[PDB]
Structure formats: structure tokens, C-alpha cells
């Protein structure tokens, strides 16, 4: 029941405090005369073990410890959008403004959001004094910026009746916006909601994936598509084109919120993203608006302590889940969760928890699942019957670039879609360097129905694309010894067709206008054309071999060099400088040219 | 029986990790179930891990978080875990802990049993005597499953083994209809399915598919999403096996239990061991994993004097496609037979990608025979395997020898290869083939050659079946 403790001991970041028995697991405390935030992680009798969040140098035995009855939490309110945050949600920009200094003072204490800025509130205009309301009900709107109107709602697990609603006008998070009366008691509320980070917000119901996710990399979009509300993981020792992927998904998608959480990042890398991303812009309704209006960032450099690394991912996904509850579509991008697992291994090791395999505690898999499985499409609580979703793209930095490590095995065993990246293709500079053989995605079958209702053509073309690419791989595995001497005619057609698929339609140049983004229909057109010429060439050679005057690839190259050149040059049908009509008519006209040339050679 | 009031303690000598240590408990016993009530009102269950004098330790199921020292109640039950088994559980859906989740009522228990089960006397074992049909032509024709055989299914991450499992579930059954359908109407067959360590998409897919097939009146279902507490992972199998036992030997039925993702079982068991502070064994997995998997697998077979049986089809994934990984190694040692799926075949867009070349069986010789099936099974299987092996190695030969030097019989072998992979193996998710259809297709594929090449078939059956 006491309120003050003492610091009995210290050893690295792990201290031991005495004279506190009225405390429980995973509450917050303040340590020393610097007021460092710490969390309880173990208990024994009267004593306890705290993990302090900032550096510990100089803390002496006998310092006070001011407990607070509240677990780790993440504030959520207007202004959260278009800002930068640390692991514990602490605005770096506000700090640099306040101190006017270059460093992080130890134990800065500033509110996560603003407390002196007025927004324009607009109540829901459908609730009068005395109306009943449960949790999750929208009751107002606030214009965050030109592109997003931050919805306001009551927290879950709360209900009552209406007492007072402020008229529309300028208010701020300090004053009272709503007033409610529960049966027997009364309470007031403000724009700000505080939520425990290691707790899953409730939902009405969960729904199947029903619409794909748009991206610019035709690789892993026609090959291993990922779905809206979907889960996947980008392996690779570094973000090999990964930053370009997030940037493109921002530039081109139906998404509404874009939360990129950095963890264990190199200093100049986050300097890169903070310099470049804010200056990227995009036309929404013919007006060019910065992508910051629909982006949040949670930086955490490598020199940050261990517990901040642990906290960053959870706070990020709490933000994402809250925005998903707001009735939007969301996309998140983790970054270097391998170092996060390593950080967890360290903090386990200091506490004398018996390791299992390579030092990784056994319960890492459970935590790993507890993170990823938050993703998915949902119907949301509340009167409006709104709808939302959230899709997480992970990041695994495997030690040694293989599957041996427990972390990569465990994350592989629970992620729906795997996006294995070849090291050899990364050395070949045919970017993006996707393996196309060790990868998979469990979203083919659901999207079959979608692609039948809208296109009726994509599924067989795609399946044949896989078959031809794979047969090329197998014939490559065969020909290594005989030096391609035994390449027959059909083998030659297969080899050339899949080689063309590799060269023209399995690699893009992200630094050029004709390659930064390919829509679905454009991919479908190019793939249709590929399967078309394969089909006609195979039909011609078979018919002529059966009947008379066999047709070999030499006469084929001779007569239709123009067709093949046009087919390679489809890649450069710049949608940036040309409309959809021109390029689609080009694809159709090249298909007809191929038809006419094959008729001529028949 | 029990009539004493229960105790409850407000003593907490400490907490650490997923455990909670207390003391001053009167006459504690091991494996006693314990309830808990937190300051905020939440209720959580648990079990007793350690006991030493008046000291006790309890591993909280739901995960430890926010447990105060002084404000915490801890009620004791005084009994080990007991399952409320009941025949009426068919048509229901449960979670790992056994709480229903399909908006239905709590099970009106018909009898209480021990979760652990009891070893079955080897004296009262009965050898299997007859086969079953799973609905897959590739499996029934080429690799028989007897009543009481324990056949695992090795797969790997990224393959459609779950779809194969669902297909097996919605089509498993018997073939007693050889003589008459009138005597076949007496059906006494059921399936119990234990999805464990499964992600959310697959859980929903299973629930939807099982509900769609329309035969939910004889399917029990247990779900344990990967969110749920890790300890519930290693309690789901025990509930499923106890239910299967009660149905098999108290209702004289014919039950087929199908377990999923035993790798997740192994991982959960590993975590329990490491939390329990025990010394690691080989590869970080505990030493007694063999004994544990033995006590899970060994609950099946047939019992003398009881008209019933239990058949096991566990599934598991091989990390890194490594056949010498301990989990598949021990699983192979304890069980009889094995079935493979191969990456390449799935990568040829062939469904189900079932690679019969390394697939074996242990009781095929005695599962099949005159009466329970046709007289033309074993020879047909041998001939199909021999023809296919010839065809594949012969394709390997023609890869370099050139197609021009091939004989015409060589083209017949290639024709056999392509047709066998086009029709016999490929079936499609809903093409419910029976055993007799499977043998019909087998004979049709064999018809390509003359009986002279078919040197594994006896002439006596050649004079009957070959000229069809």
C-alpha cells in the first residue's frame, strides 16, 4: 500500500527494488531523481526486478521509486498522424523544438500528443440528451488534414447515457468534449484515449480476404499475390528493395493509412527515410498532397536500449489496430524483427531464464504469433456498421541467408505468404530478386473467384506461366552436364519462351517511368500475350512435325523477328506518358500482328 | 464421491515467467487443477507443476500478467483434470480447453473420465483385418489403410497438406458394400479432428468446409488457434483421444482420428520443458519426447471382444525438408508406414501432390484380400508401381539418349507415365472416387500394353481381367 520504494541493487539495465509489496506484474514505475520509466518483470516476496527503459549510469542505492498503477500504454488522438515517435511513443520533433538542443535529455517528460492546439469538432448530430450508447460508437468527427477525417469514438467496455454534447467549434484535449452517466455513476471524457499496448482491441466479427492488394512489383503480384488484410514477410539480410516496396505501395494502393515501424535501424538509413518520404507527394483529386498526411513513423535506432526495441513493435501494431477500428484500410511494414528477437534473447539471458536453442528462449514463437496474428479483415464494433482491415508485411533478416535459424523457421511456420529472395538473383541485378521457387502464398484460391468475376482470363494464363518457368528451371538443371547439346526443338521453344518471360516480364527498373508501377490489367495483358505466342508456336511446330516440313526455331526467328521485338518492347509502353487506351490497343494490335505473321508462316 | 468444501489462498510468495509460486497450502497434490481470480475480476485456470512441503507452484494457463502479491485469490479443486465425455458431442465445435465456441450450450456430460487415459493391455490387442476408403484414389489403391494402423503423413511448409486433410475428412468411410447396399446401410463410422497450432485463415477454412460437406452429424471438431495459450496446445490431443476412446469402446463404433501439425505440438512441449527449468535434451527438444509421443500414438488399434476400432492419421511438417529431423524420425519409429508429398509434384500443379515412389505401407498385405475387396488388388498395385518406376527412369534415360533411339514400347512407357499422372493421381477436390473406381482406372491404364509386358500379374487373372 506504500507509495515509495528504494533501489536495492543494480546490474546492467536490470535493477532490484525493495519495500514494495503492493505492486503487480507489468505496471510502470519511476526510478531515481531522473524519473526513468521502468516496468516490473518479476516478483518475489517484498523484492522485485525492474527493467529500466533509459540508460542506468549513476543511479545509486537508495534512490526512490514512485509506483503508478497502470501498465504500459499508448495514447491515441488527433495529431497522431503525420509525426515521428520513439519506442515508448515520445514525439522527437516536440523534444527538438522544446529543448532547442541536439540530444535526448535523460528522462524528458512530455505528453505524447499536443495539449495546446485546437481542432474543429463536429458531433454526430444523431444523439440527444438521454440516448443510450455502448462502446465503440462514433460520436464526432475531426478534420486531421485535407485527406483524412479523424473519427472519434468511445473506448470499448464503456456505456451509459448522454448528458451533454458540446456544440461544434474549437476545443482541445484538455477540456471536456462529452459527458455520460452510467446507471448509478457519472463520468466525463476527452478526445484522448489511452490503451494498454499488450492487449487486443475487441471486434464484432472476422471476415475472409476478398480483394487483392495492389502493388507495383508484378513479381509476387501475379505470381504470389498478397491480399488486402493479408500477412506476409520479406526476408533478406537487409531491406533489398524493401524500402522501394513500401514507397510504391504508398504511391499506388487503395490503402488509407501507412505505418512504417523501424527497429534496429542504421542511423543514415532512417535519416534517408525521414529526408525523402516527407517530400514525396501524390495527386489524390488532381491536387498534389504530401504522403505524410497518410503516414505515421515510429523510429528506433540501433543504439536505443533493449526495452525500447521490445516496445516499438507493440506500440506500432496498437496504432495500426486502432486505425483499423476507425473504419479504414491499413497497411503496416515491420523492419528487422530479427534484431527484435535478438534483443528479447538478451533480456531473457540477463534475467537467468534457461535458454533453449542458440540462446533464443522457447517462448519466442508464442510472442511471434501473438504479434502477426493480429492482422486480418474485420467488421467493427459500433452503430455505424463500418468496415476495415489491416495487412502486415514483416521483415526477417536471416543469419547466413538460409532457413537454419529458429526465428526464420518459426515465422515461416505461421506466416501465410512467404516472399523468399534469392541471393544469386540479387547478385545478377535482375531486380526484384525474388526466388520464385522457394516461395508460396495461400491466397490463390480465394482470389480465383475475384479474378473470374472481373477478368475471366487470368487464372489459366498464370498457371501456364508457372508451368513454363518451372520447366525451364528443370531443363536448366538437366542441361548443365551435356552442354545444351541435347536441346531438342520443343525444349528450345520452352527454353526461349521462359527466358523471354525472365527477361521482359520478371524484372522492373524502379528508377524509370515505365516500370515504377504496373497495374493488374497491364500484367494480365502482358501475360496473355506471352501465353499466346507460346501456344501458337507450339501448335505450329506440332502440326508441321506431324504432317510435313517440320518447323524449327530458325524459320520462326527468321519470319517473326518483328513480332518478337514488339513483344519485348511492350515493356516500355509508358503509362506515365501515355493513356490506358493507347497501351491496351498496342497490346491487342501486337497480338493481331503475331496472329498475322504466324498465318503467313503457316 | 467428493464432498469437502474447497480451499482458497491469498498467499503469493512471488511470481516468475509463466509460473506463480505460493505456500502454506494444506496437503497439496501433483496435477491438481487450480482457478485464479485477479484484482480486475478476470478468471483464469491453471495446473500444479511443483509441490514441496507446504510450498506450491502453479503454471497459469492463460498467461501471467498483472497478478498482485496481496490481492489475488487462488481456489483449489483437489482433482486432476477430467473430461465430460458424451456421445452427443458430435456436430459440435470446441476450442482447446473444451469450451464450446459455436454459440451452443455446455456439454451435458454423460460420463467423466481421466484425461491422461490408461495403457491398453497388449494381451487384448487384435490384429487389423480389413481396409477402409479415404476418398483419395491415390491413397486407397496404392497404399491400403487397415483398421487400427498408424500411418503418418509427412509434408513441409508451403504444401497443400491441409486441403488433403479436409478432403480425407469429408470422404472417409467404409467399403462393406461389396456384397449388397442393403447390408451396407448399417453405418457406424465417425471422425474426430484435432486442428492444433493452426493460423486463423486455416481455422476458418476448416470450419466452413466441414459445415459445407453436409456430414457434420458424425464429425467432432477441436480448434486451437495459435493465439490461444501455448499450454492448451498440449491439452487438445488428450481431450481428442479421450473422446475417441469413449466413442470407440463404449459405443462400439469405428472412429478415425486425424491430428494436425504435430510440429506445433513438439514446439509447445519444448516451451513447457524450458519453462519447467529441466535440462535440455537432443537438439534442444526434451529427452522424453519419445515417451510422450508414444503415449499419444499408442492409444489405438482393436480390442478383443469389442466391435470397434481406432485409426490414426497424424500429420506433421519437416523443417527444411530434412528427413533426419528428430520429429519425423521418432514419429516414423513409433508408427507403422509413411506417406510422402513431394515439392516437385505440387510444383507441377498436380493435386493432390502425392509422391508414391517413396511412399510405403506396413499392413497392406493383410488389409486387403478376397471378400473384403476384389481378388485383383495386390497384383494391380505391384504392376502400377513397376510400370511407373520404369516410365520415370526411362524418361531419365531418354533425356540424354535422345527420343529417336527409343523403341515403340518405350513410347508406351512414356504414355503410361503421362496418363498415370494425368488421371490416377489427379482427382480434384470433390471427385469422390471409391476403391472399385480406382481399380477400374488402374486396369484401364494397364490395358495400354499387352499382358506379356505385364509380368507381375498371374496368368489366371490375366485370362479374366486383361481382355476388358
Amino acid at each position: 500500500e506504500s507509495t515509495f520504494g528504494y533501489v536495492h541493487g543494480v546490474s546492467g539495465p536490470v535493477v532490484t527494488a525493495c519495500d514494495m509489496a503492493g505492486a503487480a506484474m507489468y505496471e510502470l514505475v519511476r526510478v531515481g531523481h531522473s524519473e526513468l520509466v521502468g516496468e516490473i518483470i518479476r516478483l518475489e516476496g517484498d523484492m522485485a526486478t525492474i527493467q529500466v527503459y533509459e540508460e542506468t549510469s549513476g543511479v545509486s542505492v537508495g534512490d526512490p521509486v514512485l509506483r503508478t498503477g497502470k501498465p504500459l500504454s499508448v495514447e491515441l488522438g488527433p495529431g497522431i498522424m503525420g509525426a515521428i515517435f520513439d519506442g515508448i511513443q515520445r514525439p522527437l520533433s516536440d523534444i527538438s523544438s522544446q529543448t532547442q538542443s541536439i540530444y535526448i535529455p535523460r528522462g524528458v517528460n512530455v505528453s505524447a500528443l499536443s495539449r495546446d492546439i485546437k481542432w474543429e469538432f463536429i458531433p454526430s448530430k444523431n444523439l440527444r440528451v438521454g440516448s443510450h450508447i455502448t462502446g465503440g460508437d462514433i460520436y464526432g468527427i475531426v478534420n486531421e488534414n485535407s485527406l483524412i477525417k479523424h473519427k472519434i469514438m468511445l473506448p470499448p467496455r464503456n456505456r451509459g447515457s448522454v448528458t451533454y454534447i458540446a456544440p461544434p467549434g474549437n476545443y482541445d484535449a484538455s477540456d471536456v468534449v462529452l459527458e455520460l452517466e452510467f446507471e448509478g455513476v457519472k463520468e466525463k471524457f476527452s478526445m484522448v484515449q489511452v490503451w494498454p499496448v499488450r492487449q487486443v482491441r475487441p471486434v464484432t466479427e472476422k471476415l475472409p480476404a476478398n480483394h487483392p492488394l495492389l502493388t507495383g512489383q508484378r513479381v509476387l503480384d501475379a505470381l504470389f499475390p498478397c491480399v488486402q488484410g493479408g500477412t506476409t514477410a520479406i526476408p533478406g539480410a537487409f531491406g533489398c528493395g524493401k524500402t522501394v516496396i513500401s514507397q510504391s505501395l504508398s504511391k499506388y494502393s487503395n490503402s488509407d493509412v501507412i505505418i512504417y515501424v523501424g527497429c534496429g535501424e542504421r542511423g543514415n538509413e532512417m535519416s534517408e527515410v525521414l529526408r525523402d518520404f516527407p517530400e514525396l507527394t501524390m495527386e489524390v483529386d488532381g491536387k498534389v498532397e504530401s504522403i505524410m498526411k497518410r503516414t505515421a513513423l515510429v523510429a528506433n535506432t540501433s543504439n536505443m536500449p533493449v526495452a525500447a526495441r521490445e516496445a516499438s513493435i507493440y506500440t506500432g501494431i496498437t496504432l495500426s489496430e486502432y486505425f483499423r477500428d476507425m473504419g479504414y484500410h491499413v497497411s503496416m511494414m515491420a523492419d528487422s524483427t530479427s534484431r527484435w528477437a535478438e534483443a528479447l534473447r538478451e533480456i531473457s539471458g540477463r534475467l537467468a531464464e534457461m535458454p533453449a536453442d542458440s540462446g533464443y528462449p522457447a517462448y519466442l514463437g508464442a510472442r511471434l504469433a501473438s504479434f502477426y496474428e493480429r492482422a486480418g479483415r474485420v467488421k467493427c464494433l459500433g452503430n455505424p456498421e463500418r468496415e476495415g482491415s489491416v495487412s502486415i508485411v514483416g521483415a526477417v533478416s536471416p543469419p547466413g541467408g538460409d532457413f537454419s535459424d529458429p526465428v526464420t523457421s518459426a515465422t515461416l511456420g505461421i506466416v501465410q505468404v512467404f516472399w523468399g529472395l534469392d541471393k544469386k538473383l540479387a547478385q545478377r541485378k535482375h531486380f526484384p530478386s525474388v526466388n520464385w521457387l522457394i516461395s508460396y502464398s495461400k491466397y490463390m484460391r480465394a482470389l480465383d473467384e475475384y479474378y473470374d468475376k472481373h477478368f475471366t482470363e487470368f487464372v489459366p494464363l498464370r498457371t501456364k506461366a508457372k508451368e513454363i518457368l518451372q520447366e525451364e528451371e528443370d531443363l536448366a538443371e538437366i542441361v548443365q552436364l551435356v552442354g545444351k547439346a541435347s536441346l531438342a526443338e520443343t525444349d528450345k521453344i520452352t527454353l526461349e519462351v521462359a527466358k523471354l518471360i525472365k527477361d521482359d516480364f520478371l524484372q522492373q527498373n524502379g528508377y524509370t517511368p515505365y516500370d515504377r508501377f504496373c497495374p493488374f490489367y497491364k500484367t494480365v495483358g502482358m501475360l496473355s500475350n506471352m501465353i499466346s505466342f507460346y501456344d501458337m508456336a507450339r501448335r505450329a511446330v506440332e502440326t508441321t512435325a506431324q504432317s510435313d516440313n517440320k518447323i524449327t526455331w530458325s524459320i520462326i526467328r527468321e519470319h517473326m523477328g518483328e513480332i518478337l521485338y514488339k513483344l519485348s518492347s511492350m515493356k516500355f509502353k509508358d503509362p506515365v506518358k501515355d493513356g490506358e487506351a493507347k497501351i491496351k490497343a498496342d497490346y491487342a494490335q501486337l497480338l493481331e500482328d503475331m496472329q498475322n505473321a504466324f498465318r503467313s508462316l503457316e | 464421491y467428493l464432498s469437502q468444501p474447497r480451499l482458497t489462498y491469498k498467499t503469493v510468495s512471488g511470481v516468475n515467467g509463466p509460473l506463480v509460486i505460493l505456500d502454506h497450502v494444506k496437503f497439496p497434490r501433483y496435477a491438481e487443477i487450480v482457478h485464479l481470480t485477479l484484482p480486475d475480476g478476470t478468471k483464469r485456470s491453471g495446473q500444479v507443476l511443483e509441490v514441496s512441503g507446504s510450498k506450491a507452484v502453479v503454471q497459469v494457463f492463460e498467461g501471467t500478467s498483472g497478478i498482485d502479491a496481496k490481492k489475488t485469490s487462488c481456489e483449489f479443486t483437489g482433482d486432476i483434470l477430467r473430461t465430460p465425455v458424451s456421445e452427443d458431442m458430435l456436430g459440435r465445435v470446441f476450442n482447446g480447453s473444451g469450451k464450446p465456441i459455436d454459440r451452443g450450450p455446455v456439454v451435458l456430460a454423460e460420463d467423466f473420465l481421466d484425461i491422461m487415459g490408461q495403457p491398453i493391455n497388449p494381451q487384448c490387442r487384435i490384429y487389423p483385418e480389413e481396409m477402409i476408403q479415404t476418398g483419395i484414389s491415390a491413397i486407397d489403391g496404392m497404399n491400403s489403410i487397415a483398421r487400427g494402423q498408424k500411418i503418418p503423413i509427412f509434408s513441409a511448409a508451403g504444401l497443400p497438406h491441409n486441403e488433403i486433410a479436409a478432403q480425407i475428412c469429408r470422404q472417409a468411410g467404409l467399403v462393406k458394400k461389396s456384397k449388397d447396399v442393403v447390408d451396407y446401410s448399417e453405418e457406424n463410422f465417425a471422425i474426430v479432428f484435432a486442428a492444433m497450432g493452426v493460423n486463423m485463415e486455416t481455422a476458418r477454412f476448416f470450419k466452413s468446409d466441414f459445415e459445407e460437406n453436409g456430414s457434420m452429424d458424425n464429425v467432432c471438431l477441436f480448434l486451437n488457434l495459435a493465439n490461444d495459450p501455448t499450454i492448451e496446445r498440449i491439452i487438445t490431443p488428450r481431450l481428442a483421444l479421450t473422446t475417441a476412446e469413449f466413442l470407440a469402446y463404449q459405443c462400439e463404433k469405428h472412429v478415425l482420428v486425424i491430428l494436425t501439425d504435430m510440429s506445433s505440438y513438439a514446439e509447445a512441449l519444448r516451451e513447457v520443458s524450458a519453462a519447467r527449468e529441466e535440462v535440455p535434451g537432443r537438439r534442444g527438444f526434451p529427452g522424453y519426447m519419445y515417451t510422450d509421443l508414444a503415449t499419444i500414438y499408442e492409444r489405438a488399434g482393436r480390442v478383443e471382444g469389442r466391435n470397434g476400432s481406432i485409426t490414426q492419421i497424424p500429420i506433421l511438417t519437416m523443417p527444411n525438408d530434412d528427413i533426419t529431423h528428430p520429429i519425423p524420425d521418432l514419429t516414423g519409429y513409433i508408427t507403422e508406414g509413411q506417406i510422402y508429398v513431394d515439392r516437385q509434384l505440387h510444383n507441377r500443379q498436380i493435386y493432390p501432390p502425392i509422391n508414391v515412389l517413396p511412399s510405403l505401407s506396413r499392413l497392406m498385405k493383410s488389409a486387403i484380400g478376397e471378400g473384403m475387396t476384389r481378388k485383383d488388388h495386390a497384383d494391380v498395385s505391384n504392376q502400377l508401381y513397376a510400370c511407373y518406376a520404369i516410365g520415370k527412369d526411362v524418361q531419365a534415360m531418354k533425356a540424354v539418349v535422345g527420343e529417336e533411339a527409343l523403341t515403340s514400347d518405350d513410347l508406351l512407357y512414356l504414355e503410361f507415365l503421362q496418363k498415370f499422372e494425368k488421371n490416377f493421381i489427379t482427382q480434384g477436390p470433390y471427385e469422390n472416387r471409391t476403391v472399385y473406381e480406382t481399380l477400374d482406372i488402374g486396369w484401364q491404364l494397364l490395358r495400354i500394353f499387352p499382358k506379356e509386358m505385364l509380368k507381375r500379374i498371374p496368368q489366371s487373372t490375366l485370362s479374366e481381367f486383361y481382355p476388358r
Binding site: 537467468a352 534457461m354 535458454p355 | 527449468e277 535440462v279 535440455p280
Partner: peptide, 13 residues
């Protein structure tokens, strides 16, 4: 394995 065992034994004291 051995070094972990020795930690375990040391912790008994």
C-alpha cells in the same frame, strides 16, 4: 549443454 548444466548447479547455492 555442459556449461548450462554448470550454471544450473551453481544456482543451487
Amino acid at each position: 549443454f555442459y556449461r548450462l548444466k554448470k550454471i544450473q548447479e551453481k544456482k543451487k547455492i
